[PDB]
């Protein structure tokens, strides 16, 4: 009755947490295990659901469950191995950290990557997370996570291969900048640049005192939503305050190192 026991763990995990994402991942893990005649998929699903009940951090719960679901789907040939590799590397970053910015950033990047099938984009995200894990500097890790997530959002939003290649160049610039000691504000600025280039527009940067103000004209509000999601999450990862203003078709982003 192993598969039914796995389902029981999923029901207790679903009673422990009311979160919609944990409940759906738990339901998917239970169902994939119940549909499997593979005793190793049952083994991983059992242990992932058992650790999920032992962990205190609900964001690490999500990471553990996402990796199990992706592993079960790789066992059925349903998803590319790169998505599992990304989830596992993200889990590795999260388990090495007490900083919830890194834990949440690792999950966001893994979930955003799970939403694209572009092989080129998956390899960029995986290489980014691998470079993060090869770091002792949690400051660099947070910068890389912000860049990887921003890049993955552009892929999910359907940016062209040429624009993703341009965004990938900015990912590399951002990582090199962080290694050289760029400020948190400057790293958030680089994420804005990545999104602006990835959406084919231009930006006008003003630096008054210690603030950075970016005026972006010519974005559709659907593009504005994706850009601001990337930038606001980057600001959370970098511990920087951002304030937004909309005037007409123009978005203005104020970045304060705070």
Author numbering: 1 to 258
Question: What do the study's own words say?
Answer:
Several natural systems exhibit ‘facilitated dissociation’, in which an effector (E) can bind to a target–host (TH) complex to form an excited ternary complex (THE)20–26 from which the target dissociates quickly. We set out to design protein systems that undergo facilitated dissociation. We use a switchable target binder (host) and a flexible effector that can rapidly bind to and switch the target–host complex to induce a large steric clash with the target, forming a strained excited ternary complex. We show here that by explicitly considering excited intermediate states when designing coupled protein systems, a broad range of facilitated dissociation systems can be designed.
